[PDB]
Amino acid sequence: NATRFASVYAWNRKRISNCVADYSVLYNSASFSTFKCYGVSPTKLNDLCFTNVYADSFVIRGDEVRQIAPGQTGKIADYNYKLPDDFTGCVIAWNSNNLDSKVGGNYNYLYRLFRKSNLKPFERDISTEIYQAGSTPCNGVEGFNCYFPLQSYGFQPTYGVGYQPYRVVVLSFELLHAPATVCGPKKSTNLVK
Amino acid sequence: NATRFASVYAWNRKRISNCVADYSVLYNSASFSTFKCYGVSPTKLNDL
């Protein structure tokens, strides 16, 4: 529920720790258009503890959320946000046309159109340095086939769903190899021997 | 490198087949102004 969300070229990571995480208040809300888990199932989150908790957060079009699924390929999955293949965690998304689309075309939001190579899982990359798409060397800020490596979404509320902007969160976490620090709302009991 | 292009009121089509689409001569050539592909990234059309 933060005021503003990042462009997917600069997705914001919040580390969650030393606290009780009730997930019922997330999963039981209809206010999320998607809640898809991988290495766990959504109803089971309250039956677990987590050794760290990760909440990567950004915006993207409704018609590219499919690429956020782990081990896929395509511009988002290849150049701007990579999940590791064993991803244990859940992906959350909701429409944001009424908070984050604009009739001018909301050019506040960018993504990495080009890059040197496929980025590592959870690598993040702000670099504006010009991409040399054809086999020429290229200097300064411009040239034929020399691309500024970010491109912008057109977001207008008159554009349809799939064109519209979504806020997205990925809850990434790790289990049973380390000390717990986040746990479910479940209550303890007097330890018999 | 044709002598006469069509006009968009009746745009031409030609079918290309049985052959090699060697885009190195195409894509690297600074004779063009703008190039945009929507299904696929340019470098790997040489492979796909």
Add this chain to the structure above:
Amino acid sequence: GAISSVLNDILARLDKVEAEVQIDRLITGRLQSLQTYVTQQLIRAAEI
């Protein structure tokens, strides 16, 4: 090729059908590992 080798960890982290597909892997492998042991054992019993 399951998420884990701990059977109670798979049953904690997943529901009735997502746990089932993952447990069937452990059943397959474990069954094959115990069959390999019983094959080595019957052959060693014939030597002894």
Add this chain to the structure above:
Amino acid sequence: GAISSVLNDILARLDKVEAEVQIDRLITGRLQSLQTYVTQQLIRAAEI
């Protein structure tokens, strides 16, 4: 029952999240083929 018997031709056609499922078939079938050979060799070796 995989799409191919050539390991590099699986990897050159499918993306990793399902190329792994084909490779797992070939791993299972080839591991079953070594186990059949080694069982045959052990039983024969007891005869010899």
